[PDB]
């Protein structure tokens, strides 16, 4: 899979205006959603060469596990009885199924009109046996838990498979969750592409959205190095 | 509504402009009177002419502010259901069943 | 783009007032006929400016202007009465 995207941001106060704009532009109001991601890295206690059976260089990378959680797990008592809609974001045995992903650093190129990232994904449906916890399974693969973050936001479905997410991110630790996006929302526009044509067509869709928001909110290509999960 | 208030204000401004025009006319004719040696209208000539300028100045202050309010309202009050159909028919249906 | 409307409107106001007073100065003061023609010109320009104000106002105005069980029971009746299957 190839994910083409553009990012942006707005401060908490820009919320309502942005929601109103995206609602008119797309024709639909926002849809609330969340996801928990846990990132894993090769066990540092174990050490293996970084080469193939064909003696070809392999770069060590992180594995990302992601799933959803019922919203009720994110609403405490103070949050109680508050319209379960877009406005809520302001006031902020076996294993379960998971999405397993390994991504590559975005495609190189000066003057790229969008970010383009390859993503290898498979789906974990269930487990059984002695150590069936997703954690044990990751260890069995030779990986260890590194960090994890929660993301809550609203999304918009647009034409040609374009999706827009307005998100807030919180890292999770016993010491406490800290909001990586403290201050506002991370804006993301993207399309997932399973032929050159559809790639240039997808770029166009993103470019038209960028064009349509120019003046109001700017969408740009983030730094490749900021989208590289390789271990080092 | 708010838009109705804005439109009403604009209409009021139009009225003001009209007034300005009328008193422009008055001013002209009465200036014609003053040049002929009738000074009795000097109070009325200048009054209508001054009331014109005052009315025009008031309209200018009112109109310029209204334009500013429009610019400030961009994104706020101003842009930059089939479930309803169903309830109609169900209402209609239960009404047929129980007249 | 609205700032342009503000600028045009302000310029129009200044033009209107200035032209009014200045025309008022121009008369009182075929030279006389020429002066009359000039007066006609100024006045006409002023009127056109009024129409311009009207255009602006119109522009602004245009800117402003531009359960389940109940259903299951109800359908149960509807379908029954409609087939007339009872027939007994």
């Amino acid at each position: 899979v190839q994910q083409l995207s553009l990012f942006g941001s707005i401060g908490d106060d820009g919320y309502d205006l942005l929601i109103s704009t995206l609602t008119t532009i797309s024709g639909n109001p926002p849809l609330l959603y969340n996801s928990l991601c846990t990132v894993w890295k090769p066990n540092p206690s174990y050490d293996v060469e970084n080469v193939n059976s064909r003696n070809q260089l392999v770069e060590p990378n992180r594995i990302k596990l992601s799933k959803e959680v019922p919203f009720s797990y994110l609403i405490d008592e103070t949050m109680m009885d508050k319209p379960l809609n877009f406005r809520i974001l302001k006031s902020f045995e076996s294993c379960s199924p998971w999405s397993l992903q390994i991504s590559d650093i975005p495609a190189a190129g000066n003057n790229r009109s969008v970010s383009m990232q390859t993503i290898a994904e498979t789906i974990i449906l269930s487990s059984a046996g002695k150590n069936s916890s997703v954690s044990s399974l990751m260890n069995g693969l030779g990986y260890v838990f590194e960090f994890q973050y929660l993301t809550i936001g609203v999304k918009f479905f647009m034409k040609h498979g374009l999706i827009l997410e307005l998100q807030k991110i919180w890292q999770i630790e016993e010491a406490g969750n800290s909001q990586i996006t403290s201050g506002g929302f991370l804006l993301k526009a993207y399309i997932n592409v399973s032929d050159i044509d559809r790639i240039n067509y997808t770029e166009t869709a993103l470019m038209n959205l960028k064009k349509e928001l120019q003046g109001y909110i700017e969408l740009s290509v983030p730094d490749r190095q900021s989208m590289d999960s390789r271990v080092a | 509504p708010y838009i109705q208030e804005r439109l009403k204000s604009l209409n009021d401004i139009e009225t003001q402009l009209c007034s300005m025009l009328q008193e422009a006319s008055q001013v002209t004719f009465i200036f014609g009177e003053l040049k002929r040696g009738n000074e009795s209208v000097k109070p009325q000539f200048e009054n209508h002419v001054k009331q014109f300028y005052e009315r025009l100045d008031k309209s200018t202050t009112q109109l310029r502010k209204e334009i500013q309010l429009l610019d400030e309202n961009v994104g706020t009050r101003l842009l930059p259901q089939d479930t309803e159909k169903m309830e109609e028919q169900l209402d209609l249906l239960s009404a047929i069943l129980d007249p | 783009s609205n700032q342009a409307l503000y600028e045009k409107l302000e310029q129009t106001r200044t033009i209107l007032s200035v032209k009014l007073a200045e025309l008022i100065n121009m008369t009182t003061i075929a030279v006389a006929t020429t002066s009359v023609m000039m007066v006609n010109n100024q006045t006409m320009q002023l009127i056109k400016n009024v129409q311009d104000l009207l255009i602006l106002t119109r522009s602004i105005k245009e800117k402003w202007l531009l359960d389940e069980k109940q259903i299951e029971e109800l359908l149960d009746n509807c379908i029954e009465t409609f087939v007339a299957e009872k027939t007994t």
Partner: peptide, 20 residues
């Protein structure tokens, strides 16, 4: 009578590598 939030790249970098 009249008068004439945060750094997008940094946020992303965290989600991909965990660094704050």
């Amino acid at each position: 009578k009249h008068d004439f939030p945060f750094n997008v790249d940094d946020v992303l970098k965290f989600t991909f590598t965990g660094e704050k």
